[PDB]
Amino acid sequence: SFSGYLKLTDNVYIKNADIVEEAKKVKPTVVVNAANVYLKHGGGVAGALNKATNNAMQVESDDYIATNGPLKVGGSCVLSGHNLAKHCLHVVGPNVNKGEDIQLLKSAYENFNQHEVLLAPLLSAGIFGADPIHSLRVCVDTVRTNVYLAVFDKNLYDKLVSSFL
Template sequence: MDLSNSIRLGNVEIYFLVADITKLEVDAIVNAANSHLKHGGGVAGAISRAGGPEIQKESDEYVRKYGPVEPGGVAVTSAGKMKAKYIIHTVGPIGDKEGNDEIIKKAFENIFSKVDEFKIESIAIPFIGTGIFGYPVEKFVRVCVNETCKLFANYSGSIRKVFFCDIDSHKVTLLQSEFQKTTLN
C-alpha cells in the first residue's frame, strides 16, 4: 500500500489509496449503505462479506430499533471480523438529482461527528454513492474536497488519518488532484 500520496490539513493527514477498504488497518470504515442497511452489493456487500454475519445482524437490530437511516444519516456497528473497530454506515444520494450534494455534505458532517464521539483516530472513506447508486464522481469529489477542507480548517478532534480509497484508480487520482489544487491555493 502506497502511503506517499497524502496531504496535510492541520493535524490531519489525508491519504489517497487504490485499495480494498475491507483490508485497511484503521479504527473505522465508512460504508455506503442503503437506508435499510441491507448490505448486498457494492462497497456494502464487500464490507459485509469481509466482516461476517455480525455486521448484518447489528444493522438489522439498528433498523428495528431506530427505523431506516435517512439520506446523509449514519449508523454505527462493529466491524465484525475485520481489523477495524467500527463501521459508520451512511446513506448517500441516488443518481444525479437536485439536493444530492446536500446529502453528501450532511453525510460528512455526521460521519465526523461520530468520529469524535467514538474517539476514532483513523478512518477509511469510500466514494459514497458513486458506485451502484450512480452519484457522479465529479460531484462527489467537489463536495468531498470542500467539506473536508472546511471541517479540518480549525479541527481539534480525535481524527489523525483519513484514507479516501476506491478500487478504481481514476476516482482516487481525480480526488487527489482536486485536493492538491484546492490546498495549494
C-alpha cells in the same frame, strides 16, 4: 498505521485500494460503510464489507433496524466494526439513481467529523450514481477530521488525482 496514501490536503489522504483489504490490514478505529437507509448490504462497498464479516454485519444491522427504524439519507449510525475495525460508521449518501437530492451529500460527509480518524470510500459514487470527482470535492470541503479514502478502481483513482484542484 496507514500507508501508501497520497496526501491531498492537511487532513485528506487517498490510495488506490480495496477498502476491505485496507481494513483487514490496518484494523482502524473506524471504517465507513456506504450504506442505504435500510442497512441492506447487498452490493458495492456494503456488500463487500458485509461479506468479509461472514454476514455478521447484516445480522447486527437487521437488529438495529428492527429496533430503531431506517436512517435518513445523509444520516449515519455507529455499529460494530466486527473483524475489520473497531467500529463501523454506516453513512447514507444520496442515491441519484433513486432521484435523491445531491445536496444531502454534504450532510452525509458531516458525519465524518464526529470521528478523529476514518477509513472511508467516496460517498454517493459507484452504484449510487454521483460523479466521484464531485464527491471528492465535497469531502475535502466538508471533512475536518483525518480521512483515508480507499478508491478501488485505478482509472478513477488516476483521474481523481490528476484532476484534483
